[PDB]
Structure 1
């Protein structure tokens, strides 16, 4: 769905031996807070000896894009499971917000590698601050000075079944 980025902060349940346990934070892309908390325990159980029954959520807050109307180049590191084995992958996405870039990432993985949501882990999303650090040619071609391109063969949508003249594809 349309993803939102949440920060989720959790802890182990305090006891008499260890009052005030350590706080752990991570950033989760999810469509709503219910899924976001579910994903938090999914990754925490892969890193520390804890689960939902023996822990609690401290706070969950939505994180907005600082400059949502600025074009940014993103580098994304992902880990996904194919039909046989697990692989690491680096991809680059151009967009105006992290949530928009993540949406493209899930669509790209499903289209090119048939990887569903359950088979993908987003390791890191980082904005590429400097040009010449972009290492994918399908992104670099949009970084040239005075970029211009036409849109040949325009197709117009017709609201009526029949048309009384041959249409043109000029643009």
Structure 2
């Protein structure tokens, strides 16, 4: 829950003489360190298969780096979450350079707008959106128009000293 890395977690039920070689399951988990990621792996597995980590084991844990960490992409994000009064699915879009960058703004946004802390959200799917205008959401489409430019009116420069011998301007 912080500056996110994304991990492959791969685990399985412990072998039995009856079933050596039990099936392997993978999740992609966003977390900040690997102790959290494996926690998170088990949290989800327990809600999906009978297994507690006391009957299972983690076979591999590997960080998945962004393939094109400077191509700008538009991501579709699918999320399940709890409100003070129920639980909701929700599709949002995020424009960024990496999943890991996108996911982190997802979490800030769920916090800002819906007052959802991390314990309350599940990431359902995160996906680069291939064709522009499969993009559904205005506040990301806006950036997709041709020869896009804008000013940044009213610039405030931070001052290094407490007094200034001239009245400042906001001119950019």
TM-score, length-normalised on structure 1?
0.99
Counterpart check, 1:101 vs 2:105: no
Please give the per-residue CA displacement for 1:49-70, whole angstroms capped at 9, x wherever unaligned: 1111000000000000000010
Structure 1 stretches of at least 4 aligned residues deviating more than 3 Å after TM superposition: none
Counterpart check, 1:147 vs 2:148: yes
Deviation at 1:162, TM superposition (A): 0.5
Q: Distance in 2 between matches of 1:8 and 1:134?
A: 30
Q: Distance in 2 between matches of 1:58 and 1:77?
A: 28
Q: Distance in 2 between matches of 1:16 and 1:166?
A: 82
SS in structure 1 opposite 2:143?
coil
Q: Distance in 2 between matches of 1:124 and 1:49?
A: 23
Q: Distance in 2 between matches of 1:132 and 1:52?
A: 43
SS in structure 2 opposite 1:167?
coil
Please give the per-residue CA displacement for 1:60-103, whole angstroms capped at 9, x wherever unaligned: 00000000010000000000000011100000000000000000
* TM alignment of 1:129-140, pairs within 5 A: 129-140=130-141
Q: Distance in 1 between matches of 2:38 and 2:163?
A: 53
* TM alignment of 1:1-171, pairs within 5 A: 1-171=2-172
Q: Distance in 2 between matches of 1:104 and 1:92?
A: 10
Aligned residues: 171
Q: Distance in 2 between matches of 1:102 and 1:163?
A: 42
Q: Distance in 2 between matches of 1:166 and 1:76?
A: 46
SS in structure 1 opposite 2:78?
strand
SS in structure 2 opposite 1:49?
coil
Please give the per-residue CA displacement for 1:92-135, whole angstroms capped at 9, x wherever unaligned: 00000000000000000000000000000000000001011011
Q: Distance in 1 between matches of 2:54 and 2:132?
A: 47
**Aligned Cα root-mean-square deviation (Å):** 0.4
SS in structure 2 opposite 1:35?
helix
Please give the per-residue CA displacement for 1:127-157, whole angstroms capped at 9, x wherever unaligned: 0010110110000000000001001111011
TM-score, length-normalised on structure 2?
0.99
Unaligned 5+ segments in structure 2 are: none
